[PDB]
């Protein structure tokens, strides 16, 4: 209002040429339409105007743009935690940053066409020759053209349509775009040949695409865009991604150097990497001047600096010419905002359905440049006998290798570079000659973990800190700055020497600490039974210990996820607030089974959040700040009429809440449960009723070995494996064994890349789905909490004790059996009426309703 009133004060003073029919609200409307045109980052100015009137309008618009950009950056700096309170500022800060993200992409795409920020065309011919030499050395056949009469196209179309239907349409969905999306899915399901003929004509002929809508997700820590595509082009793109992954599984075009694949995405990224680091040829021994350096870093540039010309040339080398033109043209269609309309052909769209094959294309291209052509041939091995995810051809291959292991994430990259005595002195001499530091400035800035940084962090020595700069400088100079750079602010290179016995590495889910017992390790606190005993594959003894603490980025993401459920109180039901936290806790406790027990800061976040939600749900009932709310009104399951909150914390039930009373014929038989020896806890934590990943992987090795022995006994004796033979072999193992015995077992096996497609599925969906761990189709249900509800009812006081605190005695039911059915808030508040309205729950009160 002050900028609007001063604009009218300036326009009536800064030369109106006297009283000559001066301006009015239309001049202020001209300034209003100029700001609205700039708000969508459009080049529409206000033409056809006098020069001082336009200069006075552009001066106030440039000053208002300084105020709005400063107000956007101030709210974004307080968006991580800031205030832990946001009613309508969350939608405004996300909408203001969506305008800045669209305008910066529009100026960058316009600079790519006008100026020339290319992919360094002299070196780009070497990158096309490197992929041509690596494919010829592996002798991999290219991806064939899609057949017009493919028998495998029926299973490929059914698997892609099942993923599109289960993602969008779940429950309570209705929109103008969701109507045609569910309609085209049902029309394709009733006519598979009609959709297959339409998908064939869309690929071989239509070399363009329609507009796509970009919308940023509601992540307070770091926003991630979601690219909503056309409904007709989405079903066509899903068949291209399913056929490419099915062909890559048969042709083996994706090496195991980059493994986000659907084998075991939590354990094998951590436990098989830790067992691979321990089973190396004299890895923990470093008394002979040897040194190890684990460099963990993300590329953070292979999503927007992608060259469409190099991606099209690599697609012609990988697939047919018809599939290559359709895949490149889908990533250069349109970027339509809410009001803006940006151009394209400046990078790769990772929100499309065919982004999984494009990510694996740069994954093999960047790993070949970082490691080497002759390096990768010694790492993966010959195609006649390929290696495992962390294996080698012989012991002499890993002996003369400077890079012992190379595990590549979709965005991150891990390398356990092993150096000898002379190799470390030669590398630090090249790093000091190219980058000197006479005033000890090489140890000025250096990232370190938070896993007790007093005797377990990286020991900042002289030779150890010099090798930390040298190992990163050779990896940074190996990759060009146009394709994929490697910053230091996101990297973490923890060295290993005689001075630093503790080793640290941030894995895909959490941070890990490897410390062998023979090398005089750290204090070894071991706060719970979550220390992995990593054994050597040769000696089969206690080689090294592995600590598994939770990460700081996941703890901040859970603190933001618990803040969203706490801020959603009042505008929803009480049962919806408890069910939102139970799904958020089961996704965190199962994925961090060993980590949540061995992290004191993670348990402090759970005891604070669970006490906050029980404070939040109690205010929605009454607003008098009760003294001692009963825990039976929250921890009761939904079958017995309760909210059903998973108690991941010591919330003990008091002794005055476990007494039953009934008077049938003689008198009131006051029953009481006898557990007052030490304590009567209401419900145990979920970590006690969830198997840890060290015990799960150890039992799974005995599960499939007994399965292979019983199947060999059934094949030799010519007997049928019955359910009694698979009773004890049904638990779980590596993957849920019931997933192999499903009704759709023949169709689910022909869809490779289950973990990789589910990772980009959350990148393309609107809501942040907590399904990044695994899926129930391929992996199967692992967190079986059926034994928790039986223990929660037995510890609360039985079915008679839970019903005694309810209004079951007034309902006049002669037997406690199945009798279930602002409106759900009214039924919940009336059911626990003697529990939520008493003298102990509310102290000072004598209010009577009526007569």
């Amino acid at each position: 209002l002050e900028l609007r009133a001063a604009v009218m004060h300036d326009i009536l003073d800064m030369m109106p040429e006297g009283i000559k029919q001066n301006k009015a609200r239309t001049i202020l409307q001209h300034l209003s339409e100029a700001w609205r045109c700039w708000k969508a980052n459009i080049p529409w100015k206000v033409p056809g105007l006098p020069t001082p009137i336009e200069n006075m309008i552009l001066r106030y618009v440039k000053a208002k743009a300084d105020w709005w950009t400063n107000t956007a950056h101030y709210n974004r700096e307080r968006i991580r935690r800031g205030a832990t309170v946001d009613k309508t500022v969350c939608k405004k800060n996300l909408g203001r940053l969506t305008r800045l993200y669209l305008k910066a992409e529009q100026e960058r795409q316009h600079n790519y066409l006008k100026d020339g920020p290319y992919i360094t065309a002299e070196e780009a011919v070497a990158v096309y020759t490197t992929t041509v030499h690596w494919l010829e050395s592996r002798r991999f056949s290219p991806i064939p053209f899609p057949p017009l009469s493919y028998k495998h196209d029926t299973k490929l179309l059914i698997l892609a349509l099942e993923r599109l239907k289960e993602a969008y349409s779940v429950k309570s969905r209705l929109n103008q775009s969701q109507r045609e999306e569910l309609g085209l899915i049902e029309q394709a399901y009733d006519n598979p040949h009609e959709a297959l003929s339409r998908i064939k004509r869309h690929l071989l002929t239509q070399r363009a695409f329609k507009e796509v809508g970009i919308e940023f997700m509601d992540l307070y820590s770091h926003l991630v865009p979601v690219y909503d595509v056309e409904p007709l082009e989405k079903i066509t793109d899903a068949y291209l991604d399913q056929y490419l992954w099915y062909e890559a599984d048969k042709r083996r075009l994706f090496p195991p150097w980059i493994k986000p694949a659907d084998t075991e995405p939590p354990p094998l990224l951590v436990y098989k990497w830790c067992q691979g680091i321990n089973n190396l040829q004299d890895v923990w021994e470093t008394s002979e001047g040897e040194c190890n350096v684990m460099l963990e870093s993300r590329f953070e540039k292979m999503y927007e600096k992608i060259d469409l010309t190099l991606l099209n040339r690599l697609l012609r080398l990988i697939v047919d010419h018809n599939i290559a033109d359709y895949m490149t043209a889908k990533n250069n269609v349109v970027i339509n905002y809410k009001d803006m309309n940006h151009t394209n052909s400046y990078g790769i769209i990772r929100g499309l359905q065919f982004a999984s094959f494009i990510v694996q294309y740069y994954g093999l291209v960047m790993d070949l440049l970082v490691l080497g052509l002759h390096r990768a041939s010694e790492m993966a091995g010959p195609p006649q006998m390929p290696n495992d995810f962390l294996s080698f051809q012989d012991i002499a291959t890993e002996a003369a290798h400077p890079i012992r292991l190379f595990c590549r994430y979709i965005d991150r990259i891990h390398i356990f570079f092993r150096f000898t005595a002379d190799e470390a002195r030669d590398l630090i001499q090249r790093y000091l000659t190219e980058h000197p530091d006479p005033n000890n400035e090489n140890i000025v800035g250096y990232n370190n973990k938070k896993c007790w940084p007093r005797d377990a962090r990286m020991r900042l020595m002289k030779h150890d800190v010099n090798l930390g700069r040298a190992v990163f400088w050779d990896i940074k100079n190996r990759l060009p700055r146009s394709v994929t750079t490697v910053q230091w602010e996101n990297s973490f290179v923890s060295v290993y020497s005689k001075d630093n016995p503790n080793l640290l590495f941030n894995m895909c889910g959490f941070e890990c600490r490897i410390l062998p017992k023979c090398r005089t390790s750290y204090e070894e606190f071991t706060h719970k039974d979550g220390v992995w005993n990593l054994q050597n594959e040769v000696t089969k003894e206690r080689t090294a210990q592995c600590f598994l603490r939770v990460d700081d980025e996941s703890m901040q993401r859970f603190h933001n996820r618990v803040r969203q459920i706490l801020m959603a109180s009042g505008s929803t039901t009480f049962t919806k607030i408890v069910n939102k936290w139970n799904t958020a806790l089961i996704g965190l406790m199962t994925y961090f089974r060993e980590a949540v027990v061995n992290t004191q800061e993670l348990l402090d976040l759970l005891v604070k959040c669970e006490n906050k939600i029980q404070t939040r749900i109690k205010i929605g009932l009454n607003s008098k700040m009760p003294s001692r709310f009963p825990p039976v009104v929250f921890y009761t399951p939904k079958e017995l009429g309760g909210l059903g909150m998973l108690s991941m914390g010591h919330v003990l039930i008091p002794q005055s809440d476990l007494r039953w009373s009934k008077q049938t014929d003689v008198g009131i038989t006051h029953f009481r449960s006898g557990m007052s020896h030490e304590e009567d806890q209401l419900i145990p934590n979920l970590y006690r009723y969830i198997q840890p990943w060290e015990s799960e992987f150890i039992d799974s090795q005995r599960v499939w070995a007994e399965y292979a022995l019983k199947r060999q006994e059934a094949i030799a004796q010519n007997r049928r494996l019955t359910l009694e033979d698979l009773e004890d072999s049904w638990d779980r193992g590596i993957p849920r064994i019931n997933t192999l015995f499903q009704k759709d077992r023949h169709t689910l096996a022909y869809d490779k890349g289950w973990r990789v497609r589910t990772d980009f599925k959350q990148y393309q969906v609107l809501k942040q789905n907590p399904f990044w761990w695994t899926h129930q189709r391929h992996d199967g249900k692992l967190w079986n909490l059926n034994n928790y509800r039986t223990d929660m009812i037995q510890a609360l006081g039985g079915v008679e004790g839970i019903l005694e605190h309810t209004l079951f005695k007034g309902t006049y039911f002669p037997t406690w059996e199945g009798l279930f059915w602002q409106i759900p808030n009214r039924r919940f508040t009336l059911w626990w009426s003697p529990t939520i309205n008493r003298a102990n729950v509310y102290v000072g009160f004598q209010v009577q309703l009526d007569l």
């Binding site: 348990l603 402090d604 005891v607 404070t615 700040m625 914390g649 010591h650 003990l652 030490e678 304590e679």
Partner: peptide, 27 residues
């Protein structure tokens, strides 16, 4: 006070959002 208050994880003095005093009475 019927609980033992030693099995409890770190401390629970008052869980009613009013802990002005920060003391345990050992110093």
């Amino acid at each position: 006070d019927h609980f033992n208050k030693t099995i409890l994880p770190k401390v629970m003095q008052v869980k009613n959002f009013g802990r002005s005093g920060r003391t345990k009475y050992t110093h």
